[PDB]
mmCIF file of C-alpha atoms (C1' of nucleotides) in Angstrom:
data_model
loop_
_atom_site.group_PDB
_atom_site.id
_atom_site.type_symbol
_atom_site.label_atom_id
_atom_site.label_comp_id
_atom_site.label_asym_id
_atom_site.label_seq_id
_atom_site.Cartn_x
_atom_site.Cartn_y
_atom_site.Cartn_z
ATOM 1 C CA UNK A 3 4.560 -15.918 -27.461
ATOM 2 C CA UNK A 4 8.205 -14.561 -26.699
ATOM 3 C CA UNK A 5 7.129 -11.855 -25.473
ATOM 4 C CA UNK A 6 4.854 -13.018 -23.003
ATOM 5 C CA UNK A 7 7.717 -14.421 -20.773
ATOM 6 C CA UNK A 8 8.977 -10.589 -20.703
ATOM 7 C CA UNK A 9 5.286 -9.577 -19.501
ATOM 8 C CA UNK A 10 5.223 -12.013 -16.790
ATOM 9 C CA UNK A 11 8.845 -10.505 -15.872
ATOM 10 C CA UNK A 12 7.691 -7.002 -15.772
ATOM 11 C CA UNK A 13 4.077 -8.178 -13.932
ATOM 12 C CA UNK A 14 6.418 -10.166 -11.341
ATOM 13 C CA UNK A 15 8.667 -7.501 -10.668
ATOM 14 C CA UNK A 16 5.808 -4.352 -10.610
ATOM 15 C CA UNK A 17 4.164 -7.124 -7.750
ATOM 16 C CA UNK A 18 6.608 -4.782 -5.546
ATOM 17 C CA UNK A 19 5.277 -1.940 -6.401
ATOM 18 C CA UNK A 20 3.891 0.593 -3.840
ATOM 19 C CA UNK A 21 1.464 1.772 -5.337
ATOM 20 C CA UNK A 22 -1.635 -0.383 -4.555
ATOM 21 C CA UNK A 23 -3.685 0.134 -7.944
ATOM 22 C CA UNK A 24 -0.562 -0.513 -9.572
ATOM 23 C CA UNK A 25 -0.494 -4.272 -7.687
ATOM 24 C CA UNK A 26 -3.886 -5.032 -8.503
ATOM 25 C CA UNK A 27 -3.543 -4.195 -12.315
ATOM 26 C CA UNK A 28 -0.190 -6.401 -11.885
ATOM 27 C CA UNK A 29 -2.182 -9.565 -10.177
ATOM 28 C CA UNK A 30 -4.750 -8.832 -13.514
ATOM 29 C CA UNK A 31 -2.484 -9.222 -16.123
ATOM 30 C CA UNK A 32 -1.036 -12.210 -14.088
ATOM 31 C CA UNK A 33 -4.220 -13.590 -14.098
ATOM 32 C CA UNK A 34 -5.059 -12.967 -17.133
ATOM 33 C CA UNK A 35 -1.696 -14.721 -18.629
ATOM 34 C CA UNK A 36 -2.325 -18.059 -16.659
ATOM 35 C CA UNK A 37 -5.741 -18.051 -17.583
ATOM 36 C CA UNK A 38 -4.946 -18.713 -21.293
ATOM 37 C CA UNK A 39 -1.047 -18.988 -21.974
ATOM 38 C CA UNK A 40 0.530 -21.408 -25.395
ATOM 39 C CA UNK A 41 1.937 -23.725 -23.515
ATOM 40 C CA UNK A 42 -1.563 -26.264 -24.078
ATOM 41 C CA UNK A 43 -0.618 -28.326 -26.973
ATOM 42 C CA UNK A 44 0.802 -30.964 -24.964
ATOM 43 C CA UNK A 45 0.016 -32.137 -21.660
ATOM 44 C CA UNK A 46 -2.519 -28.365 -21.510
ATOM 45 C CA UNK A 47 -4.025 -27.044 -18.241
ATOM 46 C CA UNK A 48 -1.637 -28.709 -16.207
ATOM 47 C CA UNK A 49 1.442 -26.691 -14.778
ATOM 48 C CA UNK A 50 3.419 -29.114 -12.102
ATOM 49 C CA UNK A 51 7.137 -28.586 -11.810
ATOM 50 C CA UNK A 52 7.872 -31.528 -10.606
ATOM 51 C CA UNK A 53 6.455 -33.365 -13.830
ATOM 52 C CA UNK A 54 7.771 -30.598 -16.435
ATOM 53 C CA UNK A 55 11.136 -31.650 -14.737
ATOM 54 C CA UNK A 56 11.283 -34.560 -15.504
ATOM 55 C CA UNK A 57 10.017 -34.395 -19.066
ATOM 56 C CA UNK A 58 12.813 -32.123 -19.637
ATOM 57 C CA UNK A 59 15.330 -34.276 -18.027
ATOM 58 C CA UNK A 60 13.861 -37.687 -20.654
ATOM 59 C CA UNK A 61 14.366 -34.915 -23.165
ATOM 60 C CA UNK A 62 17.711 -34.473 -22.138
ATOM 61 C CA UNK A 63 18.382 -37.566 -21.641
ATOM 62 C CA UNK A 64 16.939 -38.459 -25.840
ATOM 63 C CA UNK A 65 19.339 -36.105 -26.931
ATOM 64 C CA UNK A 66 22.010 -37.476 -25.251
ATOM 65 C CA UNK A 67 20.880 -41.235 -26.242
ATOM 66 C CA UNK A 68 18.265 -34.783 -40.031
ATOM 67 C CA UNK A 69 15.087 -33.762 -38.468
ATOM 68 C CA UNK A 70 15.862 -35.324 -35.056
ATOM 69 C CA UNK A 71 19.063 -32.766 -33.669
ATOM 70 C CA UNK A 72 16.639 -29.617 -34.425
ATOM 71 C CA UNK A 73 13.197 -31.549 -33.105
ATOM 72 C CA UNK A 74 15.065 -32.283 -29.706
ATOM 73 C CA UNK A 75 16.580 -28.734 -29.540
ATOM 74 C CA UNK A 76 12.875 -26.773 -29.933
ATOM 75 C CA UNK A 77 11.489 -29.690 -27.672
ATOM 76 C CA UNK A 78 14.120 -28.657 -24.965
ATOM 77 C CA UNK A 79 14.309 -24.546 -25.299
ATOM 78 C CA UNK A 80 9.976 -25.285 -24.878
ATOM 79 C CA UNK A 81 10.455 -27.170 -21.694
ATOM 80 C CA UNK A 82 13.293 -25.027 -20.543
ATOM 81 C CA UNK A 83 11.108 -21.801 -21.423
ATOM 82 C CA UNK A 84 8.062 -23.925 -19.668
ATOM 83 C CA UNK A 85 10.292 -24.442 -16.786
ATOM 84 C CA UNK A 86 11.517 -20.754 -16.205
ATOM 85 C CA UNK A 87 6.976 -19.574 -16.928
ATOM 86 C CA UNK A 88 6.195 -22.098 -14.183
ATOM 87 C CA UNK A 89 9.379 -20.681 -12.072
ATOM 88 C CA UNK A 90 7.852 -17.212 -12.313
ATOM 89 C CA UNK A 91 4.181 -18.224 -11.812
ATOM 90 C CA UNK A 92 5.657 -19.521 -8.537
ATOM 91 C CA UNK A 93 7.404 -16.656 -7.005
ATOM 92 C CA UNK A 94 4.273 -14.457 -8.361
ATOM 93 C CA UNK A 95 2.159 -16.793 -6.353
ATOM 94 C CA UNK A 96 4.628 -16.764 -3.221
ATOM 95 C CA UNK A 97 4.536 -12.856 -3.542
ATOM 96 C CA UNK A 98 0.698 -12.834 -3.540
ATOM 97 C CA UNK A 99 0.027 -15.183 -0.353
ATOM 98 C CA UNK A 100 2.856 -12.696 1.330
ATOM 99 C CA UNK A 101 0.826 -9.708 -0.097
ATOM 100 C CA UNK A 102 -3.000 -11.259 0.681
ATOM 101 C CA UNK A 103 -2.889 -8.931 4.167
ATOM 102 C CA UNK A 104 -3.707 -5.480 2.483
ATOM 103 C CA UNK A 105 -5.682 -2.548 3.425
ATOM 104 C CA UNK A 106 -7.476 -2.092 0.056
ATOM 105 C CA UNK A 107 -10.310 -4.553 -0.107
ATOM 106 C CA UNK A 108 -10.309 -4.550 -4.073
ATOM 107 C CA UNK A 109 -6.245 -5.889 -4.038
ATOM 108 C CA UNK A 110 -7.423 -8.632 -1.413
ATOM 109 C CA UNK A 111 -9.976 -9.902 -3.982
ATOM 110 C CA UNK A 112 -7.855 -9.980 -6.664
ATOM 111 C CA UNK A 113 -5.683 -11.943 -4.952
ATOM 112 C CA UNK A 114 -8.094 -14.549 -4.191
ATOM 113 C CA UNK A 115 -8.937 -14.622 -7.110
ATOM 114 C CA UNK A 116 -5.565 -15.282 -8.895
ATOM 115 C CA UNK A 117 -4.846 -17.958 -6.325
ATOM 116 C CA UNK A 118 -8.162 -19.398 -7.099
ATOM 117 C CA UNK A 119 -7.352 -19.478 -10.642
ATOM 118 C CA UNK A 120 -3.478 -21.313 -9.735
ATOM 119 C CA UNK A 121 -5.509 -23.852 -7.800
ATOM 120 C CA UNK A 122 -7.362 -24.480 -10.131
ATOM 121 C CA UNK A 123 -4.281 -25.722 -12.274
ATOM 122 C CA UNK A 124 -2.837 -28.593 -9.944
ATOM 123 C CA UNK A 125 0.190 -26.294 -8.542
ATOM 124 C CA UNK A 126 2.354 -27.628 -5.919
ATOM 125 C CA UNK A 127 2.597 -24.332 -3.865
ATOM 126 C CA UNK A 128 -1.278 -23.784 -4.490
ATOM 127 C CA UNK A 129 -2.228 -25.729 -1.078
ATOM 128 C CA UNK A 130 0.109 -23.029 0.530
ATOM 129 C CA UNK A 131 -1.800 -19.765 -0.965
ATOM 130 C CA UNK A 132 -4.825 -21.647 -0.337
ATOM 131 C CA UNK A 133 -3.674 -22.420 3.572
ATOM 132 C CA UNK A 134 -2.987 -18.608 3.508
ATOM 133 C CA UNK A 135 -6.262 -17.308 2.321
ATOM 134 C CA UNK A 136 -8.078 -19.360 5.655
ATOM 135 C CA UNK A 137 -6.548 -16.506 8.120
ATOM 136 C CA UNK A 138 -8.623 -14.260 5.619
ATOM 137 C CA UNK A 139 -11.280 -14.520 8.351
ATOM 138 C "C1'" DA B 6 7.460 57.692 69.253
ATOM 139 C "C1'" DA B 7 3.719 57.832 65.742
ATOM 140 C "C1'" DA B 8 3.469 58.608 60.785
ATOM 141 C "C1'" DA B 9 4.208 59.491 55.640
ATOM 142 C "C1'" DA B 10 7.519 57.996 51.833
ATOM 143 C "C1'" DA B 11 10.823 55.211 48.931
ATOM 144 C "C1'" DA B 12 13.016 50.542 47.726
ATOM 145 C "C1'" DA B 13 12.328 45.590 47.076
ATOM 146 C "C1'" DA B 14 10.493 40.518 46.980
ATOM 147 C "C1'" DA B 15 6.119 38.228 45.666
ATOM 148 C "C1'" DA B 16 2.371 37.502 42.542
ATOM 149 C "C1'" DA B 17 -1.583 37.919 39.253
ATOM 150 C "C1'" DA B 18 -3.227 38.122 34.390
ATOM 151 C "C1'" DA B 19 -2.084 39.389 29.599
ATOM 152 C "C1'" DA B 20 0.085 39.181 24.897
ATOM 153 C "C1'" DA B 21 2.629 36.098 21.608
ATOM 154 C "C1'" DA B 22 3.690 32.668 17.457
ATOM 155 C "C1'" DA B 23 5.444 29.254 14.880
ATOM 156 C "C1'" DA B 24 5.001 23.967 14.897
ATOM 157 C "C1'" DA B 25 2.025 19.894 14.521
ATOM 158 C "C1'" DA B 26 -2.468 17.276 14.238
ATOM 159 C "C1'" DA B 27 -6.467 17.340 11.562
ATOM 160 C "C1'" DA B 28 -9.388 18.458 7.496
ATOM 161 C "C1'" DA B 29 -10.320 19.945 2.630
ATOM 162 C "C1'" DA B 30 -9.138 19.982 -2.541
ATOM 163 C "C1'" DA B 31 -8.112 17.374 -6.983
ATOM 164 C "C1'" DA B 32 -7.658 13.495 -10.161
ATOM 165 C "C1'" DA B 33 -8.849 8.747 -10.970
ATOM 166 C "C1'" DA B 34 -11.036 3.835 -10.315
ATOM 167 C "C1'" DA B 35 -15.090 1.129 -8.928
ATOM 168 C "C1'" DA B 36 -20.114 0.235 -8.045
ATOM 169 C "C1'" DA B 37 -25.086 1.207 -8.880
ATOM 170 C "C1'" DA B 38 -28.892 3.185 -11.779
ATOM 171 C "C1'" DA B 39 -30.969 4.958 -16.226
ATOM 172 C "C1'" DA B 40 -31.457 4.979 -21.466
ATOM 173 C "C1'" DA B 41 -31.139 2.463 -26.019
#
DNA sequence: AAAAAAAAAAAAAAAAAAAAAAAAAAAAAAAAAAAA
């Protein structure tokens, strides 16, 4: 699970990339990763910032208020490391929408596709992507 | 006191060649058809 965070890193980053095969193979893995990721056992399929937020700030705010120092500091480094997946699945989908205009017609499709799959997880910049995609006419 | 002959502007066509636009070669991914 660690090391997935470091894959959606790389994917985010290679998003740049000029190569075009090398961006659709990038919006794949991407895809791929939100399609089935371990952050499910509580609250699963559902990726808002706005509500991960503010569980992490009652978490916080629990703390703060044996087993109970070490429960609250794995709860929080989850949510924090749920906070930064969701930050990343953001600017990936930000970087998509900018990237939807391309020649190839195969890295177009993917991109549908992957913002497809983010709306279908309530996302707050989804409706953006999704406004996007209607100039795909 | 016309008439050859040399010098000089004016003007055709001809030869030239490397630089750039356009097309082919090579490796790999994707889509359709055939065999198990």
């Amino acid at each position: 699970n660690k090391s997935k965070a470091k894959f959606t890193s790389l994917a985010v980053r290679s998003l740049q990339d000029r190569s075009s095969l090398v961006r659709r193979n990038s919006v794949k893995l991407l895809s791929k990763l939100l399609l089935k990721h371990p952050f499910k056992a509580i609250h699963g399929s559902q990726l808002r910032l706005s509500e991960w937020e503010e569980y992490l700030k009652g978490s916080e705010s629990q703390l703060n208020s044996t087993s109970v120092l070490m429960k609250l500091k794995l709860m929080i480094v989850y949510y924090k490391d749920a906070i930064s997946f969701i930050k990343e699945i953001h600017k990936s989908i930000e970087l998509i929408s900018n990237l939807l205009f391309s020649k190839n017609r195969n890295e177009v499709l993917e991109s549908m596709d992957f913002l497809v799959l983010a709306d279908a997880f309530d996302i707050e910049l989804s409706e953006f992507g999704i406004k996007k995609m209607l100039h795909l006419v």
